[PDB]
Design a protein around this ligand. Structure first.
Ligand code: A1CEM
Length: 428
């Protein structure tokens, strides 16, 4: 059945590629402009915005975009006489939807919208810090390493649920508990009945992420509370801290930008026939046969901007840096050592100083990713407790059948956390 599962994922990637090729053709973008990641993000947000209809399911937007709910837009960058120009494009949401369905042979293809949303989340995880929002909710700033998918939309649903991390679930459940404390009727009536289902859904989602019997049992007690007060917060926090040692089951999906699938489809690659799997060589091979460009700000180091995108492409912001340095072949520095700022350009930035760089997104090897008395038990379980790769090893790109595993070497002395010494901008 894994052949039938590979065909369905391949169909979805091909439609994203076909949708991008169409959008580039409407906008009259060049090969360079089409391969600019800033343009890709604009094009990807436009389709999410057109299909969202302000539901906060695939995206969240500024009230300025709410001026005309029937139109969606964003910034487009074109290269005019060596310089870079920024223009705002406004398309009809109906026409964007029409183009998406046409690219997906009449199908709604919600699987492709989610993939771009998950790539967008992975990019924010690789770019912005969340330590101020942790302090705001009353959580430990050290919980940074468990904030997978913390930027995902308000009503992301089942698709966003799989990639959200332990600390992300704890942050939204604690934002929920704190709303009850300051509002008397938060758990009352029809609003409180809807709120109650949302609470138990979030609790069962977080419960499923725990791989021990005691952590899952502790979640049942937080979920059984009809009026969660400070007692439910102390238990959520004490469980969040335990995840920083006793690991959880968090899914990481390598979702590449549409300007990667675009050119791959444009050159005749049949994703539906050939198949596609986010696990293994498929995203690694596609990145070796790709050419992505990015706008670079003055005084920014292009190698560091390339690293931001390579980690976002690979869902690697929360992985051990000693593992990534072995796979990429180059040293993967903590965010605190990168002379770079996020790929998205701000509405007030000077375009005259803006230059561009070729992103270096290839890697040396490829690899497979595989993903009270109760408080006394989990506390004792942490005392059992070094770089860990679980797996046969790494492989070269020529070995596509994984028949020749390479055993990895890491300096356990060298940094393992991307968030150590973090000086990245705070998300907002
Ligand atoms: N799609 C993929 O197979 C893919 C996988 C991996 C990846 C991440 C981590 C590990 C090490 N351990 C972690 C625990 O689980 C067992 C494997 C191996 C491979 C990466 C990246 F992070 F290295 F960048 N990127 C990708 O694209």
């Amino acid at each position: 059945n894994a052949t039938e599962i590979r065909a369905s994922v391949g169909k979805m990637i091909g439609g994203i590629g076909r949708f991008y090729i169409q959008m580039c053709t409407e906008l009259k973008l060049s090969d360079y402009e089409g391969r600019l990641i800033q343009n890709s993000l604009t094009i990807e947000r436009m389709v999410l915005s057109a299909f969202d209809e302000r539901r906060n399911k695939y995206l969240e937007e500024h009230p300025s975009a709410g001026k005309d709910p029937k139109k969606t837009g964003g910034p487009i960058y074109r290269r005019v006489n060596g310089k870079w120009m920024r223009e705002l494009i406004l398309y009809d949401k109906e026409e964007i939807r029409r183009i998406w369905r046409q690219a997906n042979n009449g199908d709604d293809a919600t699987a492709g919208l989610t993939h771009m949303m998950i790539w967008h989340s992975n990019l924010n995880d690789a770019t912005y810090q969340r330590t101020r929002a942790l302090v705001r909710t009353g959580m430990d700033p050290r919980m940074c390493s468990l904030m997978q998918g913390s930027t995902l939309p308000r009503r992301s649903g089942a698709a966003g649920a799989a990639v959200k991390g332990v600390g992300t679930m704890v942050m939204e459940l604690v934002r929920m508990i704190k709303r009850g404390i300051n509002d008397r009727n938060f758990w009352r009536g029809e609003n409180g009945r809807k709120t109650r289902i949302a609470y138990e859904r979030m609790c069962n989602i977080l419960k499923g992420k725990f791989q021990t019997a005691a952590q899952k049992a502790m979640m049942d007690q937080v979920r059984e509370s009809r009026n969660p007060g400070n007692a439910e917060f102390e238990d959520l926090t004490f469980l969040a801290r335990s995840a920083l040692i006793l690991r959880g089951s968090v899914a990481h999906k390598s979702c590449l930008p549409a300007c990667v699938y675009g050119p791959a489809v444009a050159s005749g690659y049949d994703f539906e026939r050939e198949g596609y799997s986010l696990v293994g060589i498929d995203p690694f091979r596609l990145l070796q046969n790709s050419q992505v460009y990015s706008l670079i700000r003055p005084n920014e180091n292009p190698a560091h901007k390339s690293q931001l995108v390579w980690m976002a492409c690979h869902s690697a912001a929360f992985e051990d840096l000693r593992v990534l340095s072995f796979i990429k072949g180059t040293k993967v520095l903590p965010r605190g050592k990168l002379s770079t700022r996020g790929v998205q350009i701000a509405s007030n930035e000077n375009m005259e100083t803006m230059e561009s760089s070729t992103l270096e997104l290839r890697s040396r090897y490829w690899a497979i990713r595989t993903r009270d008395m109760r408080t006394e038990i989990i506390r004792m379980m942490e005392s059992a407790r070094d770089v860990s790769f679980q797996g046969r090893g790494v492989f070269e790109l020529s070995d596509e059948k994984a028949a020749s595993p390479i055993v990895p070497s890491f300096d356990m002395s060298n940094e393992g956390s991307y968030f150590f010494g973090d000086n990245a901008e705070e998300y907002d």
